[PDB]
Amino acid sequence: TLKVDVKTPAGKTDGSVELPAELFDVEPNIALMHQVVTAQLAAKRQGTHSTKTRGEVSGGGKKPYRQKGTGRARQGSTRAPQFTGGGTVHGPKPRDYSQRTPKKMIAAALRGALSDRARNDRIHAVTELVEGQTPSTKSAKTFLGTLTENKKVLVVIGRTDEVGAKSVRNLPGVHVISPDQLNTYDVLNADDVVFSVEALNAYISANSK
Amino acid sequence: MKVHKGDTVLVISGKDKGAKGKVLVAYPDRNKVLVEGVNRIKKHTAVSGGIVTQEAPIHVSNVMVVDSDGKPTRVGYRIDDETGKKVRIAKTNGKDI
RNA sequence: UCCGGCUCUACCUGGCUGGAGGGCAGUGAGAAAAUGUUGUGGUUAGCGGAAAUGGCUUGGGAUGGCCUGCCGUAGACGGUGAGAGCCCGGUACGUGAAAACCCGACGUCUGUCUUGAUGGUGUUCCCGAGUAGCAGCGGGCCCGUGGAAUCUGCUGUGAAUCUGCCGGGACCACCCGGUAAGCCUGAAUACUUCCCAGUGACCGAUAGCGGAUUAGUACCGUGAGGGAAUGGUGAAAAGUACCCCGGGAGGGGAGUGAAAGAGUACCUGAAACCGUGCGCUUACAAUCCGUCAGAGCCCUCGACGUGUCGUGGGGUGAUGGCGUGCCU
RNA sequence: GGCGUCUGGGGGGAACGCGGGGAAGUGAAACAUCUCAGUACCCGUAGGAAGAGAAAACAAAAUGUGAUUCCGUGAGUAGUGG
């Protein structure tokens, strides 16, 4: 197994948490994680890119002039693509880039990411980021400074820890997430991961059975 | 807009940094103010005067209102519920201005 | 549950109809309006909102760099004289509605039940008629008339009321299911002229709406209708006072500006195109216009020795050889 | 029919809806059936949604389901088709 020592904002130690090998000592698959984060960011991408074809452009209904006699090129609409002001032939249209990634692939990428972090000793666990009902970004900053000197941090906490979330929210290199929303992209963008104990055990109890 | 006509200010950004003056004019549509002794342009007129030196406006963000004791301040707003008047104050000393 | 009056008439006994306790619902499809009181319920204005005049340096200017601090439920986005969490609008967060409107809640109020239901026994009546069904012609169903059901329009014909009728893909029997020809019915669903807040591995002025600009304008057409082009000075107009040439335009000095190689013809300012100046070349020559060799001239870089030589580089090109554009 | 009075309508609106009417270019390497397509277009009508809707339904012998609508499948299948 691999043990993570729970910490406290007082620098104390509430105890320890076991990390299962099936979730934290799996071999990482770079190509898998690449595919998974690629799909993530593709789903993030909204295809809000559109253009007008020669049919959607205003006008261009009538032939500008006689087919023959003028010495001009043949035309059928002023909004044809070669025309300035004309339609876009093969241009962006709205499209959804969301890849239909398999669940096992997603989960395995997540586990590989967390396993890399655990092997390199970048997973920390804590009871709570700060004490009760007084969001203190000072306190959270100092605490995370004890836990890690890194810029990029992923804080995994329940949806009910509004106090800790808010306290650690405005920090620049911090990304807050819920364990039920854990993802390869955020875990890999993080240089360190910091669970709350309830959040960690929630991830454990969800991914065990 | 936290800086009014007649208010005394201190320029904090600009060529005239460190200079004080009365806000002679305020342009909220422009978020500018016109202060005595700063942003001194040399205007050409087609007249006696000729190259006459006058004051130009300046962005209100480049000025700070001065405290009672001669220190800059960001400007805050209490509420005088004893008269229902939202009044200005300094962030430094809390005194009205 | 109670009372009263009728219950043809008074008399005993069987139904109805008013009043009263109470339920049951309600502005709903299920009947309909009005009425108030009232919700830190909402929308339609907004307000507050922390933290650097920090030092040094560069700079026209600091929002740059280096170093100091500080806030952070606020490091979102913009602006400000150049990449600003701490200058500004603001943000997180929290507050705020007199009035109107919309959601509620409470009730007045309205309706209904309230003389009521309960559970049983055997015959007659009823259970949606020009309907169903049938035929003819058609439509549409996966089904293009096919063996063609179901559904459906028109025209004719035209029944049965429950042991009745319809459907179960011709049809018949059995069985099953259902109970047409009468009505209503929210939600899940589709859409966005318009309004608000936001986002973009969307365009960024020949793009993106036709329309960043006078835009459905100018303009064209009798008309329906068609349908453009036109963005950027600068940080701030500080938009060049004044003198000189000039009729003016335009310019030169001077000035502003950090910069006028930013002068309302203005950011950068390519090419085609047009010039001017310098070098070389060319007026006995037959030229896909160049290539290869190359005289001479000019320039340049090095060396030595002092101008000839080189591991040279370039521009020109006398002259000779070769040489029939690109695309389709 | 006339007179009077009262209540209402009339027209507009980008899209969506319901009911009706209903092409042709095209494709079939021709073309008429067929397709395009019940599209475009038109008409009449609305409502904020509409329509449909409470079985004269499905089903198949399962003690079956139990209004309607919509989505996905069933399935480009069964079938239909010069």
- Residue A13 to residue A34: CA distance in whole angstroms: 36
For residues A30 and A14, what is the distance between their CA atoms, to the nearest angstrom?
35
At A24, the amino acid letter reads F
How deeply is B48 buried, as exposed, middle or buried, from its count of CB atoms within 10 A (0-12, 13-18, 19+)?
Answer: exposed
The nucleotide closest to A49 (CA, C1' atoms): C202
Exposed, middle or buried by CB within 10 Å (0-12, 13-18, 19+), for B42? Answer: exposed
Q: How many helices (H) and strands (E) does chain B have?
A: 0, 10
β-pairing verdict for A15-19 and A2-7: antiparallel
- CA-atom Rg of chain A in angstroms: 27
Distance CA B16, CA B40 (A): 9
Experimental structure resolution, Å = 2.8
**What letter would DSSP give residue B80?**
B
Tokens of A11: 């620098």
Produce one character per residue of A189-201: b if its CB has 16 or more CB atoms within 10 Å, e if not: ebbbbbbbbbbbe
Outline where DSSP puts E strands in A133-189. 153-156, 174-177
Chain C bases under 7 Å from protein CB?
A: 47-54, 60-63, 71-76, 79-81, 84, 87-89, 92, 199-203, 206-211, 216, 226-229, 236-242, 255-258
CB-neighbour burial class of residue A30 (10 A; exposed 0-12, middle 13-18, buried 19+): exposed
The rounded distance, in Å, linking the Cα atoms of A122 and A14 is 19
Phi-psi region of A164 (alpha: psi -120 to 50; beta: other; left: phi over 0): alpha
Q: How far is CA B83 from CA B2, B49, B79, B91, B97, in A?
A: 20, 50, 9, 22, 17
Distance CA A22, CA A115 (A): 9
Q: From A142, A128, A109, A131, select the one nearest A194 (Cα to Cα).
A: A128
Q: Where are the alpha helices (DSSP H) in A5-136?
A: 21-24, 30-44, 103-119
Distance measured from the CA of protein residue A5 to the C1' of nucleotide D32, in angstroms: 86
Q: How far is CA A102 from CA A25, A45, A115, B39, B61, in A?
A: 21, 19, 20, 66, 54
